[PDB]
Symmetry: C3
Subunit: 141 residues, 3 copies
């Protein structure tokens, strides 16, 4: 009967189990993944979008730690103050409820730091959007 | 007809081929995987269990080498002598038929070394279960 | 109705999306993957073949860069001049249209360099086939 379909769904459920265990980090309904490539902010934006994903945007400590665990280099976050200087916000325009700025940040040094960078210790630093950093996308899971 | 089902099974077989090639190490009916996180023994136990897997327990040189190849840091094994000091055993209570102790091991230093650690060279060292080391689970494949 | 089949195909399409994003590098109809193990050329050949894949053979800059991005160590390419010294060719006998030799290469040093090695900077160097290097296979995607 639908024995095949039964086996397909069972096979899929385990493949998905493996992936969430070792391919990336799952926190709720988000799945953080990196292609291991560094590029400018606009590029990462296009990239994630190209995959039906969005740039990783930690909305709480758990997510921040998850991204922290995943990365081997500083990664751009889906946060900027491009439109209103000093007012950091989501790629959807939503203001942040959780922040983890590094000491002395944000400082908008050189009057040109509108992007945010997740550092290896989990802290953040505002950096120029034109710099090249690790691409990380959150996929809906 | 069942052309779709045909394609689904073919698609699944190749996805599985990719995963066994680059996601982890397959040795017989075991699939070794790591989430790249270090934690205490009890945590790793819970973790693997949480994924229908068990802590990696090499039962022969091939498996030991496979785990060795997979890891980038010392990993806990599913072996302990908690119940009977000096008598190392499986998470199922089965005694070991294969061991790869490091020189001078096991020594049960500090009278508190009931867990086993796979070192980068494949050799083993008994360590305190309360230490934090890389999590590795063997999944049924 | 075929709601399941619908869901299976949707589930598969996203699993495939994740894999092409983080498991390997896709360039056209090729999917480059590495098992992270170093071995002699003949071994890598057998390995890829064993997986219905072939040794990675960059046929253009995009592919070369893709392989370059993927690797953490020097990787053998599916190119040799075993049959006709100096005449480098595909594993299918096809002559190369794209090459990226390193300065001073190829030199066939020691009169025993019939294999090709992709270096970390993307350049190539002819090396003895008996040396052990990273295995990389291109899978049909
Ligand atoms: Ca600004
Ligand atoms: Ca600090
Ligand atoms: Ca700013
Ligand atoms: Ca700054
Ligand atoms: Ca004891
Ligand atoms: Ca030793
Ligand atoms: Ca002990
Ligand atoms: Ca010891
Ligand atoms: Ca020759
Ligand atoms: Ca050079
Ligand atoms: Ca030669
Ligand atoms: Ca040479």
């Amino acid at each position: 009967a639908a024995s095949e379909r039964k086996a397909l769904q069972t096979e899929m459920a385990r493949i998905k189990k493996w992936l969430t265990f070792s391919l990336g980090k799952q926190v709720g309904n988000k799945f953080f993944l990196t292609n291991g490539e560094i590029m400018t902010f606009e590029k990462v934006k296009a990239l994630c979008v190209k995959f039906q994903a969005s740039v990783a945007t930690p909305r709480n400590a758990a997510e921040n730690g998850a991204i922290q665990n995943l990365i081997k280099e500083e990664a751009f976050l889906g946060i900027t103050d491009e439109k209103t200087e000093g007012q950091f916000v989501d790629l959807t325009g939503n203001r942040l409820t959780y922040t983890n700025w590094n000491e002395g940040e944000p400082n908008n040094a050189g009057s040109d730091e509108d992007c945010v960078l997740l550092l290896k210790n989990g802290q953040w630093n505002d950096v120029p959007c034109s710099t090249s950093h690790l691409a990380v996308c959150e996929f809906p899971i």
